[PDB]
Amino acid sequence: MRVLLIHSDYIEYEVKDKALKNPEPISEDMKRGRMEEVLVAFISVEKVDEKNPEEVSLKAIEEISKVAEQVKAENVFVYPFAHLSSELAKPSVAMDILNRVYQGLKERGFNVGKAPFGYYKAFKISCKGHPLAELSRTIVPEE
Amino acid sequence: MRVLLIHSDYIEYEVKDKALKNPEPISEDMKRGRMEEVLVAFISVEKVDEKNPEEVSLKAIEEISKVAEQVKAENVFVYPFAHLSSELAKPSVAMDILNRVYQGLKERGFNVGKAPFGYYKAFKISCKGHPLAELSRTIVPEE
Lengths: 143, 143
Ligand SMILES: Nc1ncnc2c1ncn2[C@@H]1O[C@H](CO)[C@@H](NC(=O)[C@@H](N)CO)[C@H]1O
Ligand SMILES: Nc1ncnc2c1ncn2[C@@H]1O[C@H](CO)[C@@H](NC(=O)[C@@H](N)CO)[C@H]1O
Fold this sequence. Notes:
The structure is a homodimer. By secondary structure, the first copy, chain A, is an alpha/beta fold. Helices cover 25% and strands 38% of the residues of chain A. Chain A contains two helices and six strands; from the N terminus they run ββαβαβββ. In chain A, 43% of the residues are buried. Strand 5 of chain A pairs antiparallel with strand 5 of chain B, so a sheet runs across the interface. The site of one ligand 1 has 18 residues of chain A, from strand 2, helix 2 and strand 5. Chains A, B: It comes from Pyrococcus abyssi (strain GE5 / Orsay). Chains A, B: This is Threonine--tRNA ligase. Chains A, B: It is found in: Cytoplasm.
C-alpha cells in the first residue's frame, strides 16, 4: 500500500466519470464533499496487499493514527487514489482495504471522512506547508 | 525519480520555513506563485538518480512532455516534492535534476513554472478529475 498524507486546511471532491463498470452506488448528496483541518490520506492499494488485507489495513490504521496525532489533526479523510502506485490490487481488494482503514480510524475515535469508490473525481486541497504536512508511507504485509 | 502528475485548473504555493540550511535565495515576488490550466509535476528525486542525473532528467522531460501533450496542457509546473519517495537523493543532486527538467521543458517550448528549492511550502491545487488527470511515473537511470 502507498499512502500520501497531506495535512490540509480543507479537502473537497466532486465525483466525475465512473472508473469501473460497477462503482459504489451513491446519492446526490455523496457526489460532493468537504472536510476542514484534516489529514488527507491519499491511498493506493497495491497487488502485494492482496496477500493479507486485514494485516495491511491494521498497519495503515496505526500509521495514519500516529501521524494524525503528531500533527494534531482530529479529522482524517480516506481518499481513494489508485495512481500513487504502479502495481495496483484488484478493485474488490482495494474497496475492502479502503473500507477497513476507514472503519478502523472511526472506531479509534477520529472524525473520519471518505469518498465514493470506483470513480474519477475532481478535488481541491490546501496543504498547510508545515514541516510534517507532507508525508509518504509504504505499508505492506509481513513477508 | 518519482513523479506525480496532476492536471489542474490551477496551482498556488507559498514558501514557508526553510527546509535546508542554505535554500535557494529568493525575492519577495518569489515567495508566492500561481499557474492555471497546468500539468503539475510533483517530483521527488531519488538516491538511484545520483548515478546519472542527465539521463534521468532527459527521461523525465520526455515523459512529462508526452503526458502534457496527451492531456492538452500547454503549461507545466515543476514542483519540488521530496516526500513522494522514501529513498531521497542528496540535496545538490535534487536541485540539479529539478533544474534540468525545468530547463528541458522550457527549451521544448512549453510554458513552464517552478517553485524555489529547499523550502517547506504551502500549496493549493484543483485537480480536473478527468480519467488522465492523475498519473504516476517512476523514472530511473538505465542499470
Ligand atoms: N488499487 C486501488 N487503490 C485505490 N483505489 C482504487 C484501486 N483500484 C480501484 N480503485 C478505485 O477505482 C477508481 C479508479 O481506479 C479509483 N479512483 C481514483 O484513484 C480517483 N482518485 C481518480 O480520480 C478508486 O475509486
Ligand atoms: N530529493 C529531493 N527531491 C525533491 N526535493 C528535494 C529533495 N531534496 C531536497 N529537496 C528540496 O528541499 C525541500 C525539503 O526536502 C524540498 N521541499 C519540499 O518537498 C516541499 N514540497 C515541502 O513542503 C525541496 O525543495
